[PDB]
mmCIF file with all atom_site columns, C-alpha atoms in Angstrom:
data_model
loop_
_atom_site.group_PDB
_atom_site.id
_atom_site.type_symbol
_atom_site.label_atom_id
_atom_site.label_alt_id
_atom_site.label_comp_id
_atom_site.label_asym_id
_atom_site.label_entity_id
_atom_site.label_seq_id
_atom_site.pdbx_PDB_ins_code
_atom_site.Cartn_x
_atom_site.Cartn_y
_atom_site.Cartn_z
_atom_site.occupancy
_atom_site.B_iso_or_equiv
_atom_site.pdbx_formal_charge
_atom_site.auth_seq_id
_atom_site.auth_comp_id
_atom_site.auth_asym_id
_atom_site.auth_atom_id
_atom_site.pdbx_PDB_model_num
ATOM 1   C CA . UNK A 1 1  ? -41.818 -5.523  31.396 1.00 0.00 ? 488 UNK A CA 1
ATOM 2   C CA . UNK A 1 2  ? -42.414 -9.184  30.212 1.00 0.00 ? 489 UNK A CA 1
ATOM 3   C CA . UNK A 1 3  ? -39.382 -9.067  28.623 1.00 0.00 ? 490 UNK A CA 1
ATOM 4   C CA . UNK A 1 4  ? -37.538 -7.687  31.924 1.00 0.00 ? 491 UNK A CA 1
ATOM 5   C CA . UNK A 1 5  ? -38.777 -10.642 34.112 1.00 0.00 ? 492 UNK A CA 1
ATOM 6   C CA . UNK A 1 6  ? -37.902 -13.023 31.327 1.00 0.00 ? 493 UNK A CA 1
ATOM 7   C CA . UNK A 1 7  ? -34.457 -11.605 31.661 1.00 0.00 ? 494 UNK A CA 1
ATOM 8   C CA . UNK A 1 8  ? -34.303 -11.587 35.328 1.00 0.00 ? 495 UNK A CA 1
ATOM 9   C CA . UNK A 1 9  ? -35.640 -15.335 35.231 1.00 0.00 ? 496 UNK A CA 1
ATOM 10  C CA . UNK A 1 10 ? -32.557 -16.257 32.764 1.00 0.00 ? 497 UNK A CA 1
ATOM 11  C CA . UNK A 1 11 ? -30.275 -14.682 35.412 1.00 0.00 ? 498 UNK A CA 1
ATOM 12  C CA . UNK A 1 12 ? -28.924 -11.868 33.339 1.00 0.00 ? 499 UNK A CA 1
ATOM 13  C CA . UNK A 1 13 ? -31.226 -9.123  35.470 1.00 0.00 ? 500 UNK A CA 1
ATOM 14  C CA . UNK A 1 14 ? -31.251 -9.303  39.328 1.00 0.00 ? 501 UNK A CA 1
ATOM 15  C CA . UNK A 1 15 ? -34.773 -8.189  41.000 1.00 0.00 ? 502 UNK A CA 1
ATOM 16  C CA . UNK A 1 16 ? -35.705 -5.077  40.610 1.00 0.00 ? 503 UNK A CA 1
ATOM 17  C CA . UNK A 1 17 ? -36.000 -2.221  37.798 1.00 0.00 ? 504 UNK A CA 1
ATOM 18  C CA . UNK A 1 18 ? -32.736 -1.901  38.433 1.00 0.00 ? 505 UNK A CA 1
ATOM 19  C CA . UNK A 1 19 ? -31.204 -2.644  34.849 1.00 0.00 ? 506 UNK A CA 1
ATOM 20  C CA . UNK A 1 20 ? -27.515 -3.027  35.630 1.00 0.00 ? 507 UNK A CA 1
ATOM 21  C CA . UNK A 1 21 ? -25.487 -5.691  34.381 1.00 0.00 ? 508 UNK A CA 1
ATOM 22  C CA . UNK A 1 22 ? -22.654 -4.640  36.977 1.00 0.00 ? 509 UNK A CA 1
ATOM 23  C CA . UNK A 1 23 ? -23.557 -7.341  39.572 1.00 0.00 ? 510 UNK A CA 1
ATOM 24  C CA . UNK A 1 24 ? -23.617 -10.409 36.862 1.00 0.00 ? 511 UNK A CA 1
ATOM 25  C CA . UNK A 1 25 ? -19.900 -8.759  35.768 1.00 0.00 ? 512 UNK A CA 1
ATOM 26  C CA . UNK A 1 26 ? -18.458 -8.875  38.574 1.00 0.00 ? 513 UNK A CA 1
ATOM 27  C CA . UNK A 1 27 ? -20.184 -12.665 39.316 1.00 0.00 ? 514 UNK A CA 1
ATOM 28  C CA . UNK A 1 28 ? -18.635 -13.637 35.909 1.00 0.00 ? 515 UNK A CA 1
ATOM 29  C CA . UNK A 1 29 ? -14.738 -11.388 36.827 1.00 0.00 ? 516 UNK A CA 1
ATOM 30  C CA . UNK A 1 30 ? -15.330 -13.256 40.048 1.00 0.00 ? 517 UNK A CA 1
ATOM 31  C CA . UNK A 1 31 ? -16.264 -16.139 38.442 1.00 0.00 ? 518 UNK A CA 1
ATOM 32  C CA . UNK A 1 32 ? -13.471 -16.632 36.074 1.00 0.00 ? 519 UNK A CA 1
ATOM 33  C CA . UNK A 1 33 ? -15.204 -17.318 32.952 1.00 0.00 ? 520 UNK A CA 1
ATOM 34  C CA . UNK A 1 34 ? -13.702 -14.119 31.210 1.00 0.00 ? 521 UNK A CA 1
ATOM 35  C CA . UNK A 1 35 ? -14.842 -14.828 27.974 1.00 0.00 ? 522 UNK A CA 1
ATOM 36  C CA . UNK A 1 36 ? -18.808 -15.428 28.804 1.00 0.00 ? 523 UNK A CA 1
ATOM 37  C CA . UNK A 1 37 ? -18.467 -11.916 30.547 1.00 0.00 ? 524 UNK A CA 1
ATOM 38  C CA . UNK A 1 38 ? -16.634 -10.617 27.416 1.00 0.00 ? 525 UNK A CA 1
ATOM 39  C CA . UNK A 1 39 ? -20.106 -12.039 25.501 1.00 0.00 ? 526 UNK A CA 1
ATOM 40  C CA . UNK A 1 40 ? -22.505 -10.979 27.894 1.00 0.00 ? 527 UNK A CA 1
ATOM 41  C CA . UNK A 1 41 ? -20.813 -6.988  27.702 1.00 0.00 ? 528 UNK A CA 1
ATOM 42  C CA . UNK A 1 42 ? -21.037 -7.298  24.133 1.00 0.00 ? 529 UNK A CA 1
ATOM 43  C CA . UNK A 1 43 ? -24.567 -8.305  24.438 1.00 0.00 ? 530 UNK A CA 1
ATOM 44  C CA . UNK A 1 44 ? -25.373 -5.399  27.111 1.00 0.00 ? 531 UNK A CA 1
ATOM 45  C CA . UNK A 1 45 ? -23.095 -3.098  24.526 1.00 0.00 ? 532 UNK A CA 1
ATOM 46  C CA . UNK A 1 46 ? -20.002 -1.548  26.462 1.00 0.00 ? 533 UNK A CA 1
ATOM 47  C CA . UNK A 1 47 ? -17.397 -1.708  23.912 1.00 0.00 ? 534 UNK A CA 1
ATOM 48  C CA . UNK A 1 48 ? -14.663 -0.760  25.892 1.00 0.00 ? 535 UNK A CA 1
ATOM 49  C CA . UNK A 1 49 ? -15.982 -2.262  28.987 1.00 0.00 ? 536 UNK A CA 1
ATOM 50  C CA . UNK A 1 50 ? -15.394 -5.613  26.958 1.00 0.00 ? 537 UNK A CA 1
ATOM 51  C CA . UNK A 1 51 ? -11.846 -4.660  25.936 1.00 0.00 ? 538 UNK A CA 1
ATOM 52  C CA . UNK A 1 52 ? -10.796 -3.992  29.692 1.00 0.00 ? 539 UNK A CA 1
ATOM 53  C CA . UNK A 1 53 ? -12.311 -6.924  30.996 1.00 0.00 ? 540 UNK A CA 1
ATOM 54  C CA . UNK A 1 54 ? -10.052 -8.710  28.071 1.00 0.00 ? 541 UNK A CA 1
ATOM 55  C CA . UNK A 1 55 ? -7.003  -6.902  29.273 1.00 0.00 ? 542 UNK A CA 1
ATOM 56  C CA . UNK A 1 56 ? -7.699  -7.711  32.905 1.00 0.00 ? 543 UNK A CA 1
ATOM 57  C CA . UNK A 1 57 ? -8.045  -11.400 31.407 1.00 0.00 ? 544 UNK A CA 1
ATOM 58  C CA . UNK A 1 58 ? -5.168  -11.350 29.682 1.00 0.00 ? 545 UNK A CA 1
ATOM 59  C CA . UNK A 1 59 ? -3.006  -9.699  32.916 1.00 0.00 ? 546 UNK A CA 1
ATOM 60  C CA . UNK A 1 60 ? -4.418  -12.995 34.169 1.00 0.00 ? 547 UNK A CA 1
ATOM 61  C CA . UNK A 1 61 ? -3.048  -15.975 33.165 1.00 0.00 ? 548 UNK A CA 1
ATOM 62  C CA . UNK A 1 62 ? -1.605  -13.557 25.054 1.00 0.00 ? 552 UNK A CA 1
ATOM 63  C CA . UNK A 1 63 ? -3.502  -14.777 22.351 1.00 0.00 ? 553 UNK A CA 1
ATOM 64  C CA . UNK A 1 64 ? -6.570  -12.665 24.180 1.00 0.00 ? 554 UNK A CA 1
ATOM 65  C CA . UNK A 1 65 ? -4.183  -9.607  23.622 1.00 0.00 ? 555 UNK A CA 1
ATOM 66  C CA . UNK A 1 66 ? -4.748  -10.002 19.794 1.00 0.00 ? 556 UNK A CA 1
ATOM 67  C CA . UNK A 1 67 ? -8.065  -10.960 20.044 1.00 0.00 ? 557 UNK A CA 1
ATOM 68  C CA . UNK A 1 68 ? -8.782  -8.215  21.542 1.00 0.00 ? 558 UNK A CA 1
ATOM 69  C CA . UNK A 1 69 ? -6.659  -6.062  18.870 1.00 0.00 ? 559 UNK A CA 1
ATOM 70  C CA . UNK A 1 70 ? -8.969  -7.633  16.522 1.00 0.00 ? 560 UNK A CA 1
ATOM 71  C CA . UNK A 1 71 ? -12.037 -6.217  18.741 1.00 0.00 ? 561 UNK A CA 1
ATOM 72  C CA . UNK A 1 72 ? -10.630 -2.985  17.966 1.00 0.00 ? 562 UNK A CA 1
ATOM 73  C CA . UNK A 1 73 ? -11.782 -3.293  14.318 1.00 0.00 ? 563 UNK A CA 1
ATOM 74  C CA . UNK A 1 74 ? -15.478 -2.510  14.995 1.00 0.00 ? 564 UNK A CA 1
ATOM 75  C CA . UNK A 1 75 ? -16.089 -0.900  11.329 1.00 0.00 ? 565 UNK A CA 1
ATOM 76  C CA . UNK A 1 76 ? -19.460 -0.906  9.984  1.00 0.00 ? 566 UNK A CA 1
ATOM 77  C CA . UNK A 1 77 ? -18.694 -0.019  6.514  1.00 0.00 ? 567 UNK A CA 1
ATOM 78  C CA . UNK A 1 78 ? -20.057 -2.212  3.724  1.00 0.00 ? 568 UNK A CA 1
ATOM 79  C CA . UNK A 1 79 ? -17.063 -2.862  1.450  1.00 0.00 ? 569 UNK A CA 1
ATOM 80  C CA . UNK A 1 80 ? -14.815 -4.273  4.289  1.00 0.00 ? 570 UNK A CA 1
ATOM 81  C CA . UNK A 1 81 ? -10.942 -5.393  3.869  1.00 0.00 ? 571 UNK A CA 1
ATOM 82  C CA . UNK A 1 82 ? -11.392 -5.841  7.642  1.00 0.00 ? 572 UNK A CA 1
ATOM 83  C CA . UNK A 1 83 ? -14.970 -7.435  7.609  1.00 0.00 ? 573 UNK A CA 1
ATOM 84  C CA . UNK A 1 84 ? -14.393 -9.113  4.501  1.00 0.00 ? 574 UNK A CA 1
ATOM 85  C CA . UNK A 1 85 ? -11.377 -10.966 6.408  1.00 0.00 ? 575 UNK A CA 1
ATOM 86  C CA . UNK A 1 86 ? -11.704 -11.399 9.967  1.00 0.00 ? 576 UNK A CA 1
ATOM 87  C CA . UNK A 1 87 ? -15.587 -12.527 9.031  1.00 0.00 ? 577 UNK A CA 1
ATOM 88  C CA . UNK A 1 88 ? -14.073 -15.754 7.482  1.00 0.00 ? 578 UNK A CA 1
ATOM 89  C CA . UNK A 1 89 ? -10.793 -16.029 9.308  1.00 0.00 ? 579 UNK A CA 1
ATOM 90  C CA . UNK A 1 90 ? -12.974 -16.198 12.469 1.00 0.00 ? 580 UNK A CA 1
ATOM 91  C CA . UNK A 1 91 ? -12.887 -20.030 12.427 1.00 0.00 ? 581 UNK A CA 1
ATOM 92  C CA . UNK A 1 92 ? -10.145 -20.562 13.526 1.00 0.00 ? 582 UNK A CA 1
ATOM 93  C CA . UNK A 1 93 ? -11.100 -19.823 17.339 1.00 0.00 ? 583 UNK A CA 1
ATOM 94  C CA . UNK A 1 94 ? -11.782 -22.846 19.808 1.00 0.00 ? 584 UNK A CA 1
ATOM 95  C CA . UNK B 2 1  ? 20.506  5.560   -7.396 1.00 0.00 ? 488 UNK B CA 1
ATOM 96  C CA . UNK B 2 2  ? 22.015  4.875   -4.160 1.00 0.00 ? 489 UNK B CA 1
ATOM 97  C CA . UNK B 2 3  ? 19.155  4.362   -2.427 1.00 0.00 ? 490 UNK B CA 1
ATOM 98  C CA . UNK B 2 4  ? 18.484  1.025   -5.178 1.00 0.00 ? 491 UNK B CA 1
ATOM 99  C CA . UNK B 2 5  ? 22.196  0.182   -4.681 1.00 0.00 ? 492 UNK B CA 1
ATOM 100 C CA . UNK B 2 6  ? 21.811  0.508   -0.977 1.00 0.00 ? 493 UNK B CA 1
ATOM 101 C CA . UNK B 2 7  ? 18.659  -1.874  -0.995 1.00 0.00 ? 494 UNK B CA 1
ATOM 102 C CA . UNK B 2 8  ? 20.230  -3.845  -2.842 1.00 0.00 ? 495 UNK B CA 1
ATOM 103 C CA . UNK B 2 9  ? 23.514  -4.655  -0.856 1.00 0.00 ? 496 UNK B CA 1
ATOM 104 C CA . UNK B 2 10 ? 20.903  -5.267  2.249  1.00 0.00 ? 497 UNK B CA 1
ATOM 105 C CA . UNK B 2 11 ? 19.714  -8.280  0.831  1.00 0.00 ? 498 UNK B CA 1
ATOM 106 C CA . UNK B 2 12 ? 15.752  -6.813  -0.198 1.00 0.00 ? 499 UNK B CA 1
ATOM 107 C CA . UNK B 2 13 ? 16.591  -7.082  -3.863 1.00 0.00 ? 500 UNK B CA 1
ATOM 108 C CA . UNK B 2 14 ? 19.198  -9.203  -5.854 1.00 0.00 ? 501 UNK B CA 1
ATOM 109 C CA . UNK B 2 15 ? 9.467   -11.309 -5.611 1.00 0.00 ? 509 UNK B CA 1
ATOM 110 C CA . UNK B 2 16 ? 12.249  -13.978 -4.363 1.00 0.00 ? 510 UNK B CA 1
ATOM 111 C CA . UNK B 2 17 ? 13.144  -12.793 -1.620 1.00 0.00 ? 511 UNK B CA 1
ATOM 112 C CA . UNK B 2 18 ? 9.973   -12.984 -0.763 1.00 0.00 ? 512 UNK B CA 1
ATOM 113 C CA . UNK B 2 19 ? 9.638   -16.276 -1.697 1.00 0.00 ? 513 UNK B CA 1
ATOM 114 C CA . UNK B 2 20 ? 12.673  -17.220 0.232  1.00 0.00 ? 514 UNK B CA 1
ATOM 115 C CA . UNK B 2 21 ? 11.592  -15.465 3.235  1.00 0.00 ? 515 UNK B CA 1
ATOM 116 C CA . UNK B 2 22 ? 7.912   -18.084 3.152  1.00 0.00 ? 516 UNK B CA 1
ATOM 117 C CA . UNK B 2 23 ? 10.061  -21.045 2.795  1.00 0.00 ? 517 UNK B CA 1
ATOM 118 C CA . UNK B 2 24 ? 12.517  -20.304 5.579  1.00 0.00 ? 518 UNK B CA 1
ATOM 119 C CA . UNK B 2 25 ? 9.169   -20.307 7.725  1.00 0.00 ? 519 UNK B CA 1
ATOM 120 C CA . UNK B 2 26 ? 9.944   -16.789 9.216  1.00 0.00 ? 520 UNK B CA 1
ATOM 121 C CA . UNK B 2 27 ? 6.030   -15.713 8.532  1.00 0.00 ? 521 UNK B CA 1
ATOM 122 C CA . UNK B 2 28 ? 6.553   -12.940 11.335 1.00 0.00 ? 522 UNK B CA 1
ATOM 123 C CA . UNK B 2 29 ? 9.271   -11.739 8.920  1.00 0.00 ? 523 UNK B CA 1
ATOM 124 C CA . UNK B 2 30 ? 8.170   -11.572 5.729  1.00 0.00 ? 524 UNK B CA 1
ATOM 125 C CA . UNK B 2 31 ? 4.712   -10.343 6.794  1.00 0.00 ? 525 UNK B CA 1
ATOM 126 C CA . UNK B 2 32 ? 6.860   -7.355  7.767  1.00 0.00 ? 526 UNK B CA 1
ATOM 127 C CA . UNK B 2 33 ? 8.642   -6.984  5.028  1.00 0.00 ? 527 UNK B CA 1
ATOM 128 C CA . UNK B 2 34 ? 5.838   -7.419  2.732  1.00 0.00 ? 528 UNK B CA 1
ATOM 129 C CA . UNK B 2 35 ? 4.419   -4.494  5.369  1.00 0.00 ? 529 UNK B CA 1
ATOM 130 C CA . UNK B 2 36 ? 7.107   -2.484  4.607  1.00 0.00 ? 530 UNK B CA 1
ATOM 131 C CA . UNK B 2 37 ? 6.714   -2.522  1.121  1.00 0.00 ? 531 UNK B CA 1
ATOM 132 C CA . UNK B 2 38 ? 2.954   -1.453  1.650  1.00 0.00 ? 532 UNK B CA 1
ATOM 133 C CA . UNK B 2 39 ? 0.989   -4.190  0.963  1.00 0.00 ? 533 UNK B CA 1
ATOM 134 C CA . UNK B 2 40 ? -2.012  -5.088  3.321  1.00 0.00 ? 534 UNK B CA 1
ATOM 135 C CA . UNK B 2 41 ? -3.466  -8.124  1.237  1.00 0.00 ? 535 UNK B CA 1
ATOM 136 C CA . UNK B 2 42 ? -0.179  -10.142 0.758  1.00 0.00 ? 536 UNK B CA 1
ATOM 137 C CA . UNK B 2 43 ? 0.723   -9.522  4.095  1.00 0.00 ? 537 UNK B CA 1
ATOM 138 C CA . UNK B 2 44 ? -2.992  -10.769 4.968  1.00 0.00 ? 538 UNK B CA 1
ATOM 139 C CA . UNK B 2 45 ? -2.528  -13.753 2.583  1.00 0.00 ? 539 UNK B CA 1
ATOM 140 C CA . UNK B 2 46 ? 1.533   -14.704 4.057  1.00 0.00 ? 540 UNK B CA 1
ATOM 141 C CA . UNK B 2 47 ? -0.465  -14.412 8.041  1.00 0.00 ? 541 UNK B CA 1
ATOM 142 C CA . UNK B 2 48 ? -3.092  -16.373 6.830  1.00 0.00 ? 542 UNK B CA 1
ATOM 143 C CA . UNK B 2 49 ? -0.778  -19.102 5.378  1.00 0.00 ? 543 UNK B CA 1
ATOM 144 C CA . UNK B 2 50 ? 1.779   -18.646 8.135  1.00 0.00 ? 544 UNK B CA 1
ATOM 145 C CA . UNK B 2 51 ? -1.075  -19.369 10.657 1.00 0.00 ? 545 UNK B CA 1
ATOM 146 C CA . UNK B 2 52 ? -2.374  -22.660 8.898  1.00 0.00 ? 546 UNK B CA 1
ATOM 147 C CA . UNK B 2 53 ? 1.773   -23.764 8.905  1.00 0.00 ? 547 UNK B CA 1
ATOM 148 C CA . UNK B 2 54 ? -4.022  -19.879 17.553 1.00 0.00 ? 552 UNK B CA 1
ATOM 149 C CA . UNK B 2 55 ? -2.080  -16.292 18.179 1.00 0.00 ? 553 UNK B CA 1
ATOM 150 C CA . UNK B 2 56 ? -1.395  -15.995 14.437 1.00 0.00 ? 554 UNK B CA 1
ATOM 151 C CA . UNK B 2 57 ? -4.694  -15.789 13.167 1.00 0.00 ? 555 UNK B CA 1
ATOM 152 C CA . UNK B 2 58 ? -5.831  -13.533 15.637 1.00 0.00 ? 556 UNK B CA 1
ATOM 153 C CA . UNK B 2 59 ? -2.343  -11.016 14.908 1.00 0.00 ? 557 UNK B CA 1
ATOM 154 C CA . UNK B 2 60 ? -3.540  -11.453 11.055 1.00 0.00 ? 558 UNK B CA 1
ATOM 155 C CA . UNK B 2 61 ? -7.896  -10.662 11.814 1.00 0.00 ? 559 UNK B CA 1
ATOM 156 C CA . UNK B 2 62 ? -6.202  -7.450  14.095 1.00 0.00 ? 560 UNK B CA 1
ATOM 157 C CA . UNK B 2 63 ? -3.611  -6.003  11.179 1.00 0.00 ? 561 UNK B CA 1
ATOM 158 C CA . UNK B 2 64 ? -6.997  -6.703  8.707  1.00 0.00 ? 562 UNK B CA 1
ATOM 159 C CA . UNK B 2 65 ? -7.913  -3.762  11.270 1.00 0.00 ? 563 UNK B CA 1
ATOM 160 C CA . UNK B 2 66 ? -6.505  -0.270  9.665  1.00 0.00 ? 564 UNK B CA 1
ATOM 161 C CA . UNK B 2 67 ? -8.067  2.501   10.501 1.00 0.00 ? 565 UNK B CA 1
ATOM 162 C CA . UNK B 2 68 ? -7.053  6.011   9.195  1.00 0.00 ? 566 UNK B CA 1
ATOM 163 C CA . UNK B 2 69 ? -9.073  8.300   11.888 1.00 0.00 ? 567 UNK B CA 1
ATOM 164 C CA . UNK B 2 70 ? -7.485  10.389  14.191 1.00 0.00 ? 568 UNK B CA 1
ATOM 165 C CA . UNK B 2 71 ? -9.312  8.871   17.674 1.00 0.00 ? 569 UNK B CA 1
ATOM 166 C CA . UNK B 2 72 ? -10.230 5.931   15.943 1.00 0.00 ? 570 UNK B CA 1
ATOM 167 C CA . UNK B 2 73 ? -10.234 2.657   18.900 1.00 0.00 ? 571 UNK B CA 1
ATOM 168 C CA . UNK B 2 74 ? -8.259  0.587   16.526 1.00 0.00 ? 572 UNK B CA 1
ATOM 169 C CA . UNK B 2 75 ? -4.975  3.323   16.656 1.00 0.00 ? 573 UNK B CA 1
ATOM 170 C CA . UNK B 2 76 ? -5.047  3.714   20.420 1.00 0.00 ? 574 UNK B CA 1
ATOM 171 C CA . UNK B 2 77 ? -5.743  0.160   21.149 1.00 0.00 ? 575 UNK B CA 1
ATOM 172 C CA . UNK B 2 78 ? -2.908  -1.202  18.726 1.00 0.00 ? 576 UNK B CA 1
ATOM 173 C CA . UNK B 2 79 ? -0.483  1.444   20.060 1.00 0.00 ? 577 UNK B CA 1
ATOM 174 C CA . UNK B 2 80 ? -1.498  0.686   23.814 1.00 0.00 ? 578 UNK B CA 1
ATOM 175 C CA . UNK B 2 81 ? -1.364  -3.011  23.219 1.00 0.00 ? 579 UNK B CA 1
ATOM 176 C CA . UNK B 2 82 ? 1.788   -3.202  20.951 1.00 0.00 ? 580 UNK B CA 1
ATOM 177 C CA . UNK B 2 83 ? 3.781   -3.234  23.839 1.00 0.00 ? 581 UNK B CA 1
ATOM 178 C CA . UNK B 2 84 ? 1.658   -6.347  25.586 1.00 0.00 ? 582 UNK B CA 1
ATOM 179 C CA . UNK B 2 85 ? 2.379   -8.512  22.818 1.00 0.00 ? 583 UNK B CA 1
ATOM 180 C CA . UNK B 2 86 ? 5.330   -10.787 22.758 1.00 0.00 ? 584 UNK B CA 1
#
């Protein structure tokens, strides 16, 4: 409960006990800011949520197609090609 | 036997070609050639290079994505996105 109003005073939650990120999503799709939404779903975990909202993005506006295409390599194993790559070559971004 | 002399007339194998492919600059190339010959880490290493010589690091952290399962997100996302990119 603390932890909800702390929430709802940092803007992520509206009032209520309603927990439902779907009216700060569409703020941010509204908003423009794609890839603080993109962030924000990832925080609030909807995977694929996150990879249509990049897709809308990118029908907006190409380098966010193959970021996302990199966001399609959510592997959790511990002896990662993919994670032991993409972990460094992360950098890059701006 | 034909097959080698086949490759060979098509310019794959007189390594170098290789080689020659990285110095004419055509990265998109010979990472697909190096693909074609089935190997991920020196086609990791030419995308890695070709991107430090912001669309070709992000091509090279995807392909580091290879994923063998049947409804895996990375296959239906690569296939549904292969067409978006240019």
């Amino acid at each position: 409960e603390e932890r909800i109003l702390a929430l709802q005073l940092c803007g992520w939650i509206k009032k209520g006990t309603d927990v439902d990120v779907g009216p700060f999503l569409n703020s941010l799709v509204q908003e423009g800011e794609w890839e603080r939404a993109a962030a924000v779903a990832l925080f609030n975990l909807d995977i694929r949520r996150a990879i249509q909202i990049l897709n809308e993005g990118a029908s907006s506006e190409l380098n966010l197609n193959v970021v996302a295409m990199a966001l399609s390599g959510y592997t959790d194993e511990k002896n990662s090609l993919w994670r032991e790559m993409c972990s460094t070559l992360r950098l890059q971004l701006n």
